[PDB]
Amino acid sequence: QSAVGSIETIGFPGILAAADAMVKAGRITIVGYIRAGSARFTLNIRGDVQEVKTAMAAGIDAINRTEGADVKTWVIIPRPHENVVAVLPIDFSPEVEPFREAAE
Amino acid sequence: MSAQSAVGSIETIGFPGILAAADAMVKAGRITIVGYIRAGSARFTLNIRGDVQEVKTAMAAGIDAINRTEGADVKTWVIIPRPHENVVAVLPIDFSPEVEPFREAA
Amino acid sequence: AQSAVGSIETIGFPGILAAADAMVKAGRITIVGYIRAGSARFTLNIRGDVQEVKTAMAAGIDAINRTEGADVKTWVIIPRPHENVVAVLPIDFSPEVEPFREAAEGL
Amino acid sequence: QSAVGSIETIGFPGILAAADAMVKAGRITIVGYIRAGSARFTLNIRGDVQEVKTAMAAGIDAINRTEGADVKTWVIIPRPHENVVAVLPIDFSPEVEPFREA
Amino acid sequence: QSAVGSIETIGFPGILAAADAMVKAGRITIVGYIRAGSARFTLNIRGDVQEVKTAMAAGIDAINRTEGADVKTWVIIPRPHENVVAVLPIDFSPEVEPFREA
Amino acid sequence: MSAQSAVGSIETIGFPGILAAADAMVKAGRITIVGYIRAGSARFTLNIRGDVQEVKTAMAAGIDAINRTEGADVKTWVIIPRPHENVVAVLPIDFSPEVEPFREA
């Protein structure tokens, strides 16, 4: 299992900013987002651990430059367990398969 | 060829504000409104696509329209000039058959 | 030519029920829908001739403000909404409200 | 169109208290409830205007007697327009027709 | 109609604590739960009124021992009207039919 | 015959925190993650099943992972060692086809 990164902000424009900065800074795949409630949004990515760290640094900085946005919470799990991947929305799906291949 | 068109995103509290933004934006720039999100806590997001400069013009018009609306305020906004294809595939900012007549017209 | 759209929002369902009834009785308009916006806020959306929407809107504001526990949070009137707006936001007519559309215009 | 009454409280236990008190106090029909958000719940009833007034009074008192509940907002509309009944969830349904008839 | 009890906590762990304590303390059937919003959860139970009383006290005690939980609101209706049972989510279902029998 | 396995439940603000807790719990104890809840107000619940001591060990690890996570805090948690069947029937803590593989290991 490749590493997983997750980041959360208030507002959709912030997570859009995070998304574009993350995928351009690191060789990673965006696998999903969550409408978390209370206008908070989460973005989830996968990749080599060093690449997720690089991307996450970029996503933090991008949210903090976005009007009205700030980083609420984030984490990186270097090697997620299969039970985690099965239950939480962090697995790959056919719609992002083309981007996984490009990254690897 | 062409790159992905720019994406603009704006958010306010209350639906009347986002209605004001939508109408001002599409009248002020050569853009397509591609969707809206009921974000929670009575916040609404509007997402638009178009040439970078038309998105910048539309966004100024949207900001001004929200600030003129009773009980509305701009909470947050962004423009991404050249969105990556992975972003367009995962987040609700792509075109759809419903709005395809308007992309055409733009 | 796209008819005007009016939108109004309050905290709590009773206040939006009050708005809806006052609006439809005060102006020759059609109520086209409502939104459960979140945080117990509710939106009502109406269509009709611009002057009828204005009259209906004034009546709705006053009805909400008279309702126990409610007040007007936000509202707007767009005289001539763009087709891209009508297509994306829930402000278009539907079969369920066509009978009301016809009556307002026909009267 | 018979009258409509609507009441809203914080928490489900209060709306349950209101529902039971209203239907026992007045000749009315409970037509629906709404999970409004933020743990608020709405109850909507139909009936003759005087019966709706009687039920509403009983509903408010029941909420105030309920542990942790408070009345947030309420209204009565004597003669709701048909467009209102068509768009908002205040109409009768097969599930409550037996109660409409009684 | 048997009695109905309804209780609401902040957080899911509390409603889980309540549920387990309630069904062990009295001869009741848990009939459903509600994700109410704002991280509040409601539990609904049915049974003889004395058994619902016994269960409710046990639910309250259990919530108050649960880290981070709190009782927000609760009620007991001895004999709910059939209109209430039809509209609000407090009736029995096939999934809980075995527990109703005991 | 067999008793119902123990259930643990934990809640924090934000998804990153629940992700941290899930990975730490499943690695620390012989447990199955059976589900999560988007609780509202950006709070997320995670529910796990296992032997009583394994759930206890997993929960301690989940609490420490949430507290180490930027922007997360443990809001509430509980362990029920022996949940009643009616509870498992009504609340979302039962096993499912998706997690059957993990139950067996």
SSE topology:
The structure is a homohexamer.
Chain A: E1 3-10, H1 12-25, E2 29-37, E3 40-47, H2 49-65, E4 71-77, H3 82-87, H4 97-103
Antiparallel strand pairs in A: 1-3, 1-4, 2-3
PDB class: carboxysome
Keywords: cyclic hexamer, c6 point symmetry, carboxysome
Assembly: hexameric
General description of the model:
The structure is a homohexamer. In chain A, strand 2 (29-37) and strand 3 form a beta hairpin. In chain A, helix 1 (12-25) packs across helix 2 (49-65). Chain A contains 4 helices and 4 strands. Chain A starts with a strand and ends with a helix. The first copy, chain A, has helices spanning 12-25, 49-65, 82-87, 97-103, and strands at 3-10, 29-37, 40-47, 71-77. The first copy, chain A, is globular and about 35 Å long. By secondary structure, chain A is α+β, with helices and mostly antiparallel strands. The longest helix of chain A has 17 residues, at 49-65. Chain A has a 4-stranded antiparallel sheet with strand order 2-3-1-4. Chain A has one domain (1-104): Alpha-Beta Plaits, CATH 3.30.70. Chains in contact: A-B, A-F, B-C, C-D, D-E, E-F. Chains A and B meet through helix 1 and strand 2 of A and strand 1, strand 2, strand 3, strand 4 and helix 3 of B. Chain A: Homohexamer. Interacts with full-length CcmM. Forms mixed heterohexamers with CcmK3, probably with 1:5 CcmK3:CcmK4 stoichiometry. Only very weak interactions with CcmK1 and CcmK2 were seen. Chain A: It comes from Synechocystis sp. (strain ATCC 27184 / PCC 6803 / Kazusa).
